[PDB]
Design an enzyme around this catalytic site. Structure first.
Site, PDB file in Angstrom:
ATOM      1  N   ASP A 530     -21.338 -44.956 -10.581  1.00  0.00           N
ATOM      2  CA  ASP A 530     -21.235 -43.781 -11.440  1.00  0.00           C
ATOM      3  C   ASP A 530     -20.380 -42.733 -10.744  1.00  0.00           C
ATOM      4  O   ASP A 530     -20.121 -42.820  -9.546  1.00  0.00           O
ATOM      5  CB  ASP A 530     -22.612 -43.221 -11.801  1.00  0.00           C
ATOM      6  CG  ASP A 530     -22.609 -42.491 -13.130  1.00  0.00           C
ATOM      7  OD1 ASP A 530     -21.612 -41.802 -13.425  1.00  0.00           O
ATOM      8  OD2 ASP A 530     -23.592 -42.622 -13.889  1.00  0.00           O
ATOM      9  N   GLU A 568      -7.508 -44.762  -3.013  1.00  0.00           N
ATOM     10  CA  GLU A 568      -8.510 -45.294  -2.100  1.00  0.00           C
ATOM     11  C   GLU A 568      -9.815 -45.684  -2.782  1.00  0.00           C
ATOM     12  O   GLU A 568     -10.687 -46.262  -2.121  1.00  0.00           O
ATOM     13  CB  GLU A 568      -8.814 -44.277  -0.998  1.00  0.00           C
ATOM     14  CG  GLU A 568      -7.704 -44.096   0.033  1.00  0.00           C
ATOM     15  CD  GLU A 568      -6.715 -43.001  -0.336  1.00  0.00           C
ATOM     16  OE1 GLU A 568      -6.767 -42.495  -1.477  1.00  0.00           O
ATOM     17  OE2 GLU A 568      -5.883 -42.641   0.522  1.00  0.00           O
ATOM     18  N   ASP A 600     -20.046 -47.252 -14.976  1.00  0.00           N
ATOM     19  CA  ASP A 600     -20.256 -46.118 -15.860  1.00  0.00           C
ATOM     20  C   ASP A 600     -19.320 -44.992 -15.445  1.00  0.00           C
ATOM     21  O   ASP A 600     -18.760 -44.994 -14.344  1.00  0.00           O
ATOM     22  CB  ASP A 600     -21.718 -45.654 -15.830  1.00  0.00           C
ATOM     23  CG  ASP A 600     -22.062 -44.716 -16.970  1.00  0.00           C
ATOM     24  OD1 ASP A 600     -21.138 -44.312 -17.709  1.00  0.00           O
ATOM     25  OD2 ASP A 600     -23.253 -44.379 -17.128  1.00  0.00           O
ATOM     26  N   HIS A 733     -25.619 -41.952 -10.350  1.00  0.00           N
ATOM     27  CA  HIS A 733     -25.318 -40.613 -10.845  1.00  0.00           C
ATOM     28  C   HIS A 733     -26.025 -39.553 -10.014  1.00  0.00           C
ATOM     29  O   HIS A 733     -25.421 -38.546  -9.627  1.00  0.00           O
ATOM     30  CB  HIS A 733     -25.722 -40.499 -12.315  1.00  0.00           C
ATOM     31  CG  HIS A 733     -25.386 -39.178 -12.931  1.00  0.00           C
ATOM     32  ND1 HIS A 733     -24.185 -38.540 -12.713  1.00  0.00           N
ATOM     33  CD2 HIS A 733     -26.091 -38.378 -13.765  1.00  0.00           C
ATOM     34  CE1 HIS A 733     -24.166 -37.401 -13.381  1.00  0.00           C
ATOM     35  NE2 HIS A 733     -25.311 -37.279 -14.029  1.00  0.00           N
TER      36      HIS A 733
HETATM   37 MG   LIG Z   1     -24.670 -42.676 -15.571  1.00  0.00          MG
END
Ligand SMILES: [Mg+2]
Ligand SMILES: [Mg+2]
Length: 758
Positions: A530, A568, A600, A733
């Site tokens: 994420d 990178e 994601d 996340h």
């Molecule tokens: Mg997410």
RNA sequence: UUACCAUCAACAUGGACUC
RNA sequence: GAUGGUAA
């Protein structure tokens, strides 16, 4: 892409099926004998010879779409209005598209925009609003009116019109009146108040219904000042407004509102000069007033307006369809091209996946209908519990008593969960400065050397102290830490639940395992990526990476990568994957046969790049493992989608149940993909999540991928119950958010064996 | 910072003659 | 980042 493993279910969508009557979308390449400057002259030249083509032409400058087949070669002659030149124009057939071909789509949208504008609906931004709907609030002279976000899509079932409801808020008082009130209350300074309220806010001009964001305000120019128009004449602002729109600016001492460029303007600022000086008398600010924002009672009614049950959403769509049907001219505009909408939203059939089974140490239970198991986790022992015997509790003096009960409450609930707790080391602070907190925590951490966790109670709601604490306890001196706000433990009758939740969070942070779910794929490894974007700016985007390192998906290896450019990202992710595989081999003494990646944070525009470039680059990394070729499966998850599902109850359209999967007639036309609604919806319409499989070398059947995704939706340990996305994505996340927002650094590699980022 | 979810606003992708 | 909802 389509499979069946559960009970069928009848849903409806906010999609209205479009029907095409001809198969006559003929593309033509149009060429002009001289180089003809400006597309307007070309369009006029084509217009005069409409007897040859017709009047249903969609023309953009080079490619001309017709619903009728002309001759193979068509040659015509015309005269220029300026130079009186002899222009011989050529029309040649290029291809015969089907009515729904993904290439004749972006002018059906133009036709629809023309239709909606023909319904007398103003265009604001990219939505169609109705000024003839004036449900006022009259608390700050406010007005709300509704509109639609509408487009024409095509999916593997055909063409559809996607329509969603929206509302726009605009003040009645002009900018001049509000700044006059501002200056009326004060007199010494009108810098701070007017500048802060105007600068950064977005206004709308009602003589053309156009929105501008105001970069600055100047108390230095008047309508008597002038600007050069079309490089022809320096005209005063008053005269320009009077000539174009015939409106008079009454009082001339006012500021001018500067919106200097629109910086992007497609590629760049070809129109670099910009310098828009909007009048304050003819502008109206857009948004919910901040004084209204703080006031709860005013916000309540507007919240009632914005939030809609599925019944009201469906009713709004029905009203839009009836409005389009009633106006004959709009229907003629649509049917000139052979299109014809249906009379109701398209009704689909999905299915409900079977319920999963959750396992705790010495017990198992089948998940309930609403997909929530908060009671059982706190009532039975977890899979793995880590006993705390040496931990410290830092508390300020004023919260002293308020801290004690918490510890006491933590001694009454540790029994049922099976976790063993000893009394903490109490640390009372002389004062509440952050320096004192950091010094005391550092002192105990340095001296004792056995502390398994530091629990800090914050008195006042300030984020600098929290950032300092986390920087100390996750970067400089690695040790798991918990931060408790004194308000949360301030009220009884909620102390037991929050105490249980906090204790489970600490057990997870120490290296515990709460619950598990059956996994049918042997030797499986699951990965989740994420990304985090800074709202403030600074444009450093952090990508978090979380990979399971055991056979039951209860241990995780976590890494984070910092980089602004895209050079990178791929090789750092390769390093992360290599490290994850090495840890997997160390723990299990064997490398994984199958690897599932859940990617994601990828917008639609880059969905083509990630499929074609990044994934093979990652797959190249397995060549350093002595002839090891696993079977990869890669998904792309999109949370932000504008498709709503309404389960069709016998009477009205209601919110759909959790665990609903759809793979019919609405999915992408080139990828294998499916929509999944997993979480329990209580407020609004059920917005599912779109999973797109961009690589499948394991030949997994669709049923198996859907089942694996739904199972992974049950394994997020910070919330007992199903969440929207798979647990690895949410973990990534949170890790990226902590690393990019609070720490501004990557956490110490000592702490990456547990879920310290909870 | 006990959490999750919702509208809004940032954000990012980009996307698109008038003062 | 604000306001609202929900929770052994
Ligand atoms: Mg997410
Ligand atoms: Mg936390």
């Amino acid at each position: 892409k389509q499979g069946s493993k559960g009970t069928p279910q009848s849903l409806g969508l906010n999609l209205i099926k479009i029907q095409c009557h001809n198969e006559a979308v003929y593309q033509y390449h149009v060429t002009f004998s001289p180089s003809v400057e400006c597309k307007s002259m070309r369009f006029g030249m084509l217009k005069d010879h409409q007897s040859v083509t017709g009047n249903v032409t969609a023309f953009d400058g080079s490619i001309l779409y017709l619903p009728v087949k002309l001759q193979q070669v068509v040659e015509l002659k015309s005269q220029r209005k300026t130079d009186d030149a002899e222009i011989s124009i050529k029309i040649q057939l290029t291809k015969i598209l089907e009515p729904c071909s993904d290439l004749c789509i972006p002018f059906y949208n133009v036709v629809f925009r023309r239709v909606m504008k023909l319904l007398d609906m103003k265009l604001v931004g990219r939505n169609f609003y109705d000024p003839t709907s004036a449900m006022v609030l009259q608390q700050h002279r406010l007005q709300i009116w509704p509109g639609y976000a509408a487009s024409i899509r095509r999916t593997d079932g055909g063409l559809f019109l996607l329509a969603d409801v929206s509302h726009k808020v605009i003040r009645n008082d002009s900018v001049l009146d509000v700044m006059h009130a501002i200056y009326q209350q004060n007199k010494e300074h009108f810098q701070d108040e007017c500048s802060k309220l105007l600068v950064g806010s977005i206004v709308i001009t009602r003589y053309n219904n156009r929105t501008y964001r105001i970069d600055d305000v100047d108390w230095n120019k008047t309508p008597k000042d002038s600007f050069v128009m079309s490089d022809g004449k320096e005209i005063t602002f008053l005269e320009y407004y009077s000539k174009n729109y015939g409106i008079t600016v009454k009082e001339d001492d006012q500021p001018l509102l500067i919106h200097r460029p629109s910086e992007r303007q497609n590629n760049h600022g070809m129109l670099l000069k910009g310098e828009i000086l909007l009048l304050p008398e003819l502008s109206f600010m857009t948004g919910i007033p901040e004084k209204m924002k703080k006031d709860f009672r005013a916000m309540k009614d507007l919240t009632q307006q914005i939030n809609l049950s599925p019944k009201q959403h469906h009713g709004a769509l029905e009203c839009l369809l009836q409005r389009i049907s009633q106006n004959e001219t709009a229907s003629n505009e649509l049917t000139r091209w052979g299109l014809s909408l249906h009379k109701d939203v398209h009704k689909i059939e999905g299915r409900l996946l079977p319920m999963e089974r959750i396992n705790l140490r010495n017990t198992s239970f089948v998940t309930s209908e609403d997909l929530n198991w908060v009671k059982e986790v706190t009532r039975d022992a977890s899979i793995l519990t880590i006993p705390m015997h040496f931990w410290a509790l830092f508390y300020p003096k004023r919260a002293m008593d308020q801290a004690r009960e918490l510890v006491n409450m933590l001694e009454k609930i540790a029994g049922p969960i099976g976790m063993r707790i000893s009394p903490p080391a109490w640390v009372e602070l002389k004062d509440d400065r952050i320096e004192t907190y950091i010094r005391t925590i550092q002192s105990l951490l340095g001296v004792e050397g056995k502390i398994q966790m530091v629990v800090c109670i914050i008195m006042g709601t300030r984020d600098d102290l929290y950032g300092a604490i986390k920087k100390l306890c996750c970067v400089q001196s690695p040790v798991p830490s918990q931060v408790i706000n004194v308000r949360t433990i301030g009220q009884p009758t909620r102390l037991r639940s929050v105490a249980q939740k906090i204790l489970l969070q600490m057990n997870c942070k120490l290296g515990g395992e709460l619950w598990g779910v059956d996994i049918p794929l042997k030797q499986l490894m699951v990965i989740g990526m994420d990304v985090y974007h800074d709202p403030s700016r600074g444009m450093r985007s952090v990508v978090g990476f979380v990979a399971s390192i055991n056979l039951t998906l209860t241990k995780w290896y976590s890494r984070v990568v910092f980089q602004m450019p895209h050079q990178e990202i791929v090789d750092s992710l390769k390093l992360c994957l290599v490290g994850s595989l090495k840890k997997y081999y160390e723990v299990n003494h064997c490398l994984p046969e199958k690897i599932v990646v859940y990617r994601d944070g990828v917008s639609d525009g880059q969905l083509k790049t990630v499929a074609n470039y990044e994934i093979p680059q990652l797959q190249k990394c397995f060549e350093a493992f002595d002839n090891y070729h696993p079977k990869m499966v890669v998904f792309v998850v999109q949370k932000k989608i504008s498709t709503n599902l309404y389960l069709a109850a016998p009477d009205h359209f209601v919110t759909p149940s959790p665990g609903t999967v759809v793979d019919h007639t609405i999915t992408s036309c080139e990828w294998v993909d499916f929509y999944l609604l997993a979480h329990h919806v209580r407020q609004g319409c059920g917005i599912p999540t779109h999973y797109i499989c961009v690589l499948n070398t394991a030949n997994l059947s669709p049923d198996h991928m859907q089942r694996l995704t739904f199972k992974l939706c049950h394994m997020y340990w910070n919330w007992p119950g199903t969440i929207r996305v798979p647990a690895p994505c949410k973990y990534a996340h949170k890790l990226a958010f902590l690393s990019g927002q609070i720490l501004h650094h990557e956490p110490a590699i000592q702490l990456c064996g547990n879920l310290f980022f909870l």
